Every structure is written in structure tokens, then in C-alpha cells.
Design a binder for this molecule. Sequence first.
Ligand code: CA
Ligand code: CA
Ligand code: MN
Length: 376
Amino acid sequence: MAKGKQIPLTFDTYQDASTGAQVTRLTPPDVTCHRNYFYQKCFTRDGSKLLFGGAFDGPWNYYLLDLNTQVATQLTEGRGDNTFGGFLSPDDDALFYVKDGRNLMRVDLATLEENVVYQVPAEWVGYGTWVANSDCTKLVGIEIRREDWVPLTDWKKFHEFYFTKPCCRLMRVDLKTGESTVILQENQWLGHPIYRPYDDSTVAFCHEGPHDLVDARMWLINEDGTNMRKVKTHAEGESCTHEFWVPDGSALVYVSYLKGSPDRFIYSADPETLENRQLTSMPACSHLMSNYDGSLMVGDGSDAENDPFLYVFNMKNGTQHRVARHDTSWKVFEGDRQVTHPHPSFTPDDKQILFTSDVHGKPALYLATLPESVWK
Ligand SMILES: [Ca+2]
Ligand SMILES: [Ca+2]
Ligand SMILES: [Mn+2]
């Protein structure tokens, strides 16, 4: 294998053991393959091609899978790809991803030629995922001062890091010029910056750290650095997590729970009004994602083997649907703590959900067909 090489994949279709839903496995479970982060574009607009990470060449690299032809083309090569943060451009003509922790790359999908768009400078370390605006002309991301950075290779390191008050800057990068601007810089752990879809003037970001210790999880700031404000004031004992933009940019959605009760709730916040509203209760899930207008949501039942199910929430109906099993082990493969995360999202047609599981050996990609009962 190498950049540009093609491999044919077998698609194995069966019925879910619990729900009877049609499920198709897309990748062979003797090779580690996984989907990207759920909020990053991986399907082309017409739903015919799919970006994923695979280990066929040895390390984990990007591939584009033609879902009609069942051929995967290797997009990137070498040992330093972050195969989770990558996304397709709006026009389906480019892949953006980070190589060697520092180099934000653009890959031309026709030629497979790469260009380095931006390099995190020497005195800083890129943290987390770079996220584009809807126009795909700008990126936001976090850089942490090298002096303050440590490799966060386990959950104890991740826990302790919060108390060090690392110097973090929220960067915005121009994709055409490669120029960078600091939006915000503070001595506290900043994370998950995400442009509001169709509103470049609004950037959401978090205070990373233990859920029950952070002053407030969710923040908004204007693109120019002005008007930094919290999305909500946490009630006593309240944790807020799993925040994401509805892809149409209508609302910020998140999960809320209170110390003393296991119950989880989906909430929505209006970005202009900052009214936060409780939408529905949910089973404990590890992630949450919606379709384009937030009329459907999907979540992956959490580890304690506790809950092997994928749930779909019909937000028009207020109904909840146990649609299929993910059956992931949640185990670490090759040091990576995200690789077995199901990370469900909807196909562009809203008929299927895409997720990772290692149920059949190594991590693989699956598509589960939503039952007619989701829409009654
Ligand atoms: Ca090779
Ligand atoms: Ca509004
Ligand atoms: Mn995850």
C-alpha cells in the first residue's frame, strides 16, 4: 500500500441481535479501522463516499471509501497522522488533517497532493481538534505553551493537568493566507473550540477539566475576542458535557446531570437569547450528535459492558428508540483511547447511523439502518 493505492472491501450485512435492524460492516475486523470524530464532515454531500482511518499500510492513515464500488483509496501515508480530527471540505474536494501534531495539512482529493496550511510554532503545542467555519476559509483550535504541555496519555494525567493552569490560546487560522490570530489567551485549560455553523462571529469553547470542578463548562466568544460569556450558570451539583452545535447553527446542544441522581438530560441553548431549555431525558451515553436541523439525535450507550445500545431521539415526537447494538468493548488499541468509541452520526439521508465498534475483533466501521418506527 501507499498514497493513491486502492483496496477492495467486502461489505458484510446482517441483522442486529437485539433489534433486528439491518447492519452492514464496511471494513475487515482483522485490520484496525475507525470513523472520524462525529462532529467533523466524513461523508461527501451526496452520501456516496466516506472518509475513515485504517491500518492497512501499517500505521493509521486516511482512506476514502466509495460506498457504491466498495473500493477504498489510501489518501495519506506515513507514521504521524491524526486520523480522528480530519474533515472533508464543503465542496468534497479536499481533506484537512493534522500531521505530526503540528502541521495542518490540506490534501487535494483529485491529485492527492498535500500542502501545509499552518504550522503550530516551536514554543507551542497543538491541543485537540481544529474546526473550520462553514465556508471552510478559517479554522479555530487550541495551542498550549510547550513549557506547560505534557503528553496526556492516561486519565490520571488528564485529571492532574487541569490543576496546573496551563497557558492556552484560542487561535484562528486563515486557510488562504495561513495567517494566525489569537482570539483569547488565559492561564486555564481551554478546549473544543467550534465555529457556530453559518455564523463566523460566534465561537463556542470549553473550560476543560473534571466535570464537577470546572467553574463552567461552556463558553461563547466573538470572533474578534470580545464578549466572552458563559452559555449558562451551572446549578448546584450540575455537570454539563457533550456540547455540540446543531449543524444548521440554530442551537448549542449539551447533556446535563446532577450529583445525587443518575438521570441525564438533553438541553438546548439559544446562542442569541442564552435561554437554556430541557428537551428530554436520555440513557447515559458517551457522546451525542444530531442530524442537520436537530430533529433527530443519536447517542452511544456508555460503559460502566453496561449499555451496548445505540439510541435515536426523535425530537419532534419526544420519542426514544433503541435502534441497534454498538457492542464496543471501549478497550484501548495501540495507546488510543478514542479508537473504540462508537461516535455515532447520521448519514446525509438520515436513514442510517455510522459508528465504530470492535465487536468482531479490531475496530471496524458499521452502518445501522434506522427502523421505520423512528418516524412511526
Ligand atoms: Ca507501503
Ligand atoms: Ca436564536
Ligand atoms: Mn469519544
